[PDB]
Amino acid sequence: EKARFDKMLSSQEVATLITALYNPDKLRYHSIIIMTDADVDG
DNA sequence: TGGCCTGCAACGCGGGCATCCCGATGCCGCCGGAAGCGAGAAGAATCATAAGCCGTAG
């Protein structure tokens, strides 16, 4: 929301690897889990 | 200390009255020249959009 741009991209690895970016075709990795540290930055 | 203002008597000519000629003027017919209103075009300006640095944090 702070900077919305369809061209702005740095990694793009997550969306490229989970789906094709639209998603009903490729539904690979139906189960995802996000492990994160217990600090405030986590 | 020097010059402006004014009373006064003598010289001077202009105001007042009469009048015919002249030039402006109102009127009428006729010709012309900005105008101004709307409309189209150009330049000037203030609001709205994308960071950059400051210093820690990942």
- Elucidation technique: cryo-EM
- Three-class secondary structure assignment of chain A: CCCCCCCCCCCCHHHHHHCCCCCCCCCCCCCCCCCCCCCCCC
Indicate the resolution in Å: 6.6
User: Residue A21 CA to nucleotide B28 C1', Å?
Assistant: 95
Distance A22 CA to B58 C1' (A): 32
Q: Which amino acid is at A13?
A: E
Q: How far apart (Å, rounded) are the C-alpha atoms in residues A39 and A12?
A: 26
